[PDB]
Design a protein around this ligand. Structure first.
Ligand SMILES: O=C(O)CCCC[C@@H]1SC[C@@H]2NC(=O)N[C@@H]21
Ligand SMILES: O=C(O)CCCC[C@@H]1SC[C@@H]2NC(=O)N[C@@H]21
Lengths: 121, 122
C-alpha cells in the first residue's frame, strides 16, 4: 500500500518511516524528537488492507518499544489511528505510552496523547 | 523470552496467543469474545527485551487490525501495557480501538478501555 508507505513527521518533529505490506503489516523505524530516546527504534503494526472506499480513513496502529542499541527507556508506545489519503495525506493518532513500573507505581505507568503525522513527498 | 510467550486470556474471555522474540518482537493471533469479530486475527507488537533490574514490569504493546478471511470491521486496536512475571503472571493493559471514519466523525472514532490478561483458561 503506496498510500501509507513512506516517511512521516509529527508535530513534535519525530520521524516515522514505514512500509505497508500487502498482508496488512506495518514495518519500519521511529525516531522521537522528545523523551528518553535517541536514534531509530523498530516499529511493527497492522493496518486495514481492504478499507471502505467511502471517504473513511484507514484504521491502523503500531508499537515502538523504546530499546535500541543506543538506549533503553523500559517503556513502549502504541499509536492507534487512521490514515487519511489524498494529496495532503495524514495519520491522525492517539497514543498510550506505558513504562515498566513496580506494582506500587502501576497507577502512574501510562501516559496518553495524540499525534498527527504528515507525509513527506 | 519464555514468560510472555504463551496463551493468554482476558476478563472478557478473548484469547491472545503470542510469541516473544529474543530481539523484542511480539507475534501472534487474537481472538475477541466480543465486538465485530470472529475467529483469529494477526497481531504484531514489541516489548522491552532487557527490562529493569528492580522488579519493574516489562513494557510492551501490540496491534490487531480487525480484518481476516471472515470479516473486516475497518478498525484497529492497540494494547499498551506491561508484563508482570512471577507466580500468577499478568499482562495489564490499556487499549485504543480506532474505527475508520469520515473526518466529520473523527471525534467519535476511538474507544478506550483496559484489559488484564492471565494464562488461566476460561
Ligand atoms: O521517554 C520514553 O519513554 C520514550 C520516548 C517517548 C516519546 C513519545 S511516544 C509518544 C510521543 N510522540 C512522539 O513522537 N514522541 C512521544
Ligand atoms: O468491534 C470491532 O471493531 C473489532 C473487535 C474489537 C474487540 C475489542 S479490542 C478491545 C477489547 N478487548 C477484547 O478482547 N475485545 C475488545
Amino acid at each position: 500500500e503506496a498510500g501509507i508507505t513512506g516517511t512521516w513527521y509529527n508535530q513534535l518533529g519525530s520521524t516515522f518511516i514505514v512500509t505497508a505490506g500487502a498482508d496488512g503489516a506495518l514495518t519500519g523505524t521511529y525516531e522521537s524528537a522528545v523523551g528518553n530516546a535517541e536514534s531509530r527504534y523498530v516499529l511493527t503494526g497492522r493496518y486495514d488492507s481492504a478499507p471502505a472506499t467511502d471517504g473513511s480513513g484507514t484504521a491502523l496502529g503500531w508499537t515502538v518499544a523504546w530499546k535500541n542499541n543506543y538506549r533503553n527507556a523500559h517503556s513502549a508506545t502504541t499509536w492507534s489511528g487512521q490514515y487519511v489519503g489524498g494529496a495532503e495525506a495524514r495519520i491522525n493518532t492517539q497514543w498510550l505510552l506505558t513504562x515498566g513500573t513496580t506494582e506500587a507505581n502501576a497507577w502512574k505507568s501510562t501516559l496518553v496523547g495524540h499525534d498527527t503525522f504528515t507525509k513527506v513527498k
